[PDB]
């Protein structure tokens, strides 16, 4: 995308074949897993809409998810053009004409105009909003993908604490809810779905317990072969 | 993170996709190993907090252990706001106001803002403290990984002394203790948890004779005080 | 390690991650092979003790061998500390003060001072001696690894000269003894450890046949010591 | 080796890590094959002896054959101290000292001194002769490898011309005779070692037929010919 | 510590034995915190573990004094 700083003005560079290969490979390896969202946020340097849209268009087997994501982007673009500060009428020549919801989209925007409003006038967050809409759509996909409704994870009488925690944190990452609520829910839910023996020693710790303390306490609860005891 | 020397002043640049793939493979196959702490130290190049923050969010496996590391960083950041000099608060125009304890974290500070206080005015150890807190979290993760104490690392009857030494040194890497204390322990521990048959010839060495000499003697004999044949 | 001469003033520049993966791949597959030792010398550009120390911290299973190498560096550092010219605490104001054994070691040294002493006052070979001590340590590890002796490598009944010479030369790199002696004993050894089928032709060639000349003759005979008298 | 032309005077740097891995990989794939000699010639850009010594030192499997080359290199170094200018022991103030046979090797010379004699007075062909001496040794190595001689090549009845000519071409890679002599060998041996039915095609075509024409006839007739005359 | 042995006799013997160790103060102190709990009988060990991390020697002795016997049994077994 558009880069260059200390050596002067920005130049529009193309995407790497290496990053494109990673996008194809990661999908074969772990298609809808939550870690895709921070990787996309981190790697998207100079996040221009049409360039971001290239990753969406190079979709393989997971095209159905992308089609839903595109509908969500269209809903978000429609909301931007009508429920947020609306664009006026005729203006004097040479002004950008405050970009519309459809101007954010790659289909209805040319490269010259898209880069023009991105840096000729003071930087507009056009890439940031489109990227945010993609993040919002990806969050919907991981939410739908999750096979467990958060409270479906349980610990069997022979299942170790570490595996119970792995299962619990796997569904926890797809929760998409408020942090205070998530902490309060985590505190009660972990105890409720725990096995009788595990729950009996877990209740000794009581209020004010934190994850570092919980992990430390469950070191003596051990793994397979070892028979977990209160003492 | 920040980079550039030969052409002039430092500018913020993202890490290679091959490096990210290398990290992903290391987390997948070497998960809780103490060998990953130097690998992370090498890969945590420069000093911008944002790149380290995104890198740690790419985990698909041991997310709960990583979350305990985030919790550790959050409470270490709390101590930077309280214990350490955080000044009076109000500041006259034209200053960068100095980061508070929670301003160190990439989740609470903007990228240009993070770069600003370490580039617009002379260096401050914001990258080093954030890295130190992550390293401290990794030290805690290997402390939870361990399932057997040093005195529980006993040598079996059919178990060779060489395998026992590897088990001891691998176990030792996660214990977090003073070098003098570890050396002082090394004098009696090595022959203490060994089996009777190998001890027959290894007890003859006596006082002094460092690990190198003890191993040179051990290699020369093999097995439980004498080697065995497979084919 | 430090880099740049023609280009400008010296820069301390981090190793590439591909180089680190290549080192890990070599250590993982070749373990205690003598082939690793020149590869370490080849890869260790601009000899900087901290970077050299980092390359000894990434080992997996074989940590105990690495610990012996680290103790060997301490042993040679101690040799520098008291048997090589002894330093005195009192020195004139404005001097960098030439390093003691502990200063050479990664344990008490700081990277800013370490780069400082090698770049300020006239060149001290701090990196080269540390690299040499590591190589000396690696040269002790091959002895620990080697499980054979000069008269244990004997050609079997169905073994050809190529298999017999390969085991001898594989062993030879880990010998750690005088070259002058090795040459003088080699002439006796090649005849002595041969099988009776190949021994008679080796004896028949006699004195005045060098390694190339013997290898040239041994190429045409065929099998595990084919008919030695052609009439 | 020493590198830089465009930005001014050359700086000494080590070999690239990827090149070192490639050298090891090529050895695993095809250590003794004749095309390794041009591959080595191509990769040895900047023939500084110390860098060249690293390539020799890092060899894996074929160590016994590899150590035979040192005898030839030492022998050519002995020839350099005889047939080439040998100079004298005395030396005038501040001179770099013209190389002796044992100054050529990196093992018995010092790097700064080595760069000094290669560059202080008009270039000395130290790297070029060392590469040629190594090539002479590599030409000896393919003699040791060789499983078939040039006069051992013969076409069987079930062996087509393409299979036969490939075998003949492979054996012509290391023919170790004059190009003038080789022209006669090519003209005579190719027809002479062909099978009777294939020979009939060659016999009919006869004198005044180039390699292009011979190949064209072989291509048109098919296989090694067939049980009845076509020409 | 045996099943019917009281903590005061056990810690008295531990201190007496430790008195002849002639090692640096750090070596003795660091060990004492973990070893006393580890070599204790199940019921006593449960009570010592219940007191847990932190606290002074006076606080530990105070807790032990009121506990009584060689360790009175619990209901979660």
Curated annotation (Swiss-Prot), chains A, B, C, D:
Changing residue 38 to A: Retains infectivity. Changing residue 57 to S: Reduces protein stability. Loss of binding to FG repeats of human NUP153. Loss of binding to CPSF6. Decreases virus ability to integrate in intrafenic regions compared to wild-type virus. Residues 57-95 are annotated as: Interaction with human PPIA/CYPA and NUP153. Changing residue 173 to A: Does not bind FG repeats of human NUP153. Loss of infectivity. Phosphorylated possibly by host MAPK1; this phosphorylation is necessary for Pin1-mediated virion uncoating. It is found in: Virion. Residues 145-231 are annotated as: Dimerization/Multimerization of capsid protein p24. Residues 85-93 are annotated as: PPIA/CYPA-binding loop. Changing residue 57 to A: Reduces binding to human NUP153 and CPSF6. Reduces infectivity to non-dividing cells. Retains infectivity to dividing cells. Changing residue 34 to A: Loss of infectivity. Changing residue 74 to A: Loss of binding to NUP153 and CPSF6. The modification Phosphoserine is found at residue 16. Homodimer; the homodimer further multimerizes as homohexamers or homopentamers. Interacts with host NUP98. Interacts with host PPIA/CYPA; this interaction stabilizes the capsid. Interacts with host NUP153. Interacts with host PDZD8; this interaction stabilizes the capsid. Interacts with host TRIM5; this interaction destabilizes the capsid. Interacts with host CPSF6. Interacts with host NONO; the interaction is weak. Forms the conical core that encapsulates the genomic RNA-nucleocapsid complex in the virion. Most core are conical, with only 7% tubular. The core is constituted by capsid protein hexamer subunits. The core is disassembled soon after virion entry. The capsid promotes immune invasion by cloaking viral DNA from CGAS detection. Host restriction factors such as TRIM5-alpha or TRIMCyp bind retroviral capsids and cause premature capsid disassembly, leading to blocks in reverse transcription. Capsid restriction by TRIM5 is one of the factors which restricts HIV-1 to the human species. This is Capsid protein p24. It comes from Human immunodeficiency virus type 1 group M subtype B (isolate NY5) (HIV-1). The lineage of its organism: Viruses, Riboviria, Pararnavirae, Artverviricota, Revtraviricetes. The chain holds residues 133 to 363 of 500 of the full protein.
């Amino acid at each position: 995308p558009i880069v260059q700083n200390l050596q002067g003005q920005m130049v529009h560079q193309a995407i790497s074949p290496r990053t494109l290969n990673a996008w194809v490979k990661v999908v074969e390896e772990k298609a809808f897993s939550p870690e895709v969202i921070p990787m996309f946020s981190a790697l998207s340097e100079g996040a221009t809409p049409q360039d971001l849209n290239t990753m969406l268009n190079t979709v393989g087997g997971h095209q159905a998810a992308m089609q839903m994501l595109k509908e969500t982007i269209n809903e978000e673009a429609a909301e931007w053009d009508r429920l947020h500060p609306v664009h006026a009428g005729p203006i004097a020549p040479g002004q950008m004409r405050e970009p519309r919801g459809s101007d954010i989209a790659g289909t209805t925007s040319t490269l010259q105009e898209q880069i023009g409003w991105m840096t000729h006038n003071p930087p507009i967050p056009v890439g940031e909003i489109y990227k945010r809409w993609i993040i919002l759509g990806l969050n919907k996909i991981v939410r739908m993908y999750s096979p467990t409704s958060i409270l479906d994870i349980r610990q069997g009488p022979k299942e170790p604490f570490r595996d119970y925690v792995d299962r619990f944190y796997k569904t926890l990452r797809a929760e998409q809810a408020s942090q205070e609520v998530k902490n309060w829910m985590t505190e009660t839910l972990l105890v409720q779905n725990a096995n009788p023996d595990c729950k009996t020693i877990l209740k000794a710790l009581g209020p004010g317990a934190t994850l570092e303390e919980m992990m430390t306490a469950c070191q003596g609860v051990g793994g397979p072969g070892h028979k977990a005891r209160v003492l």
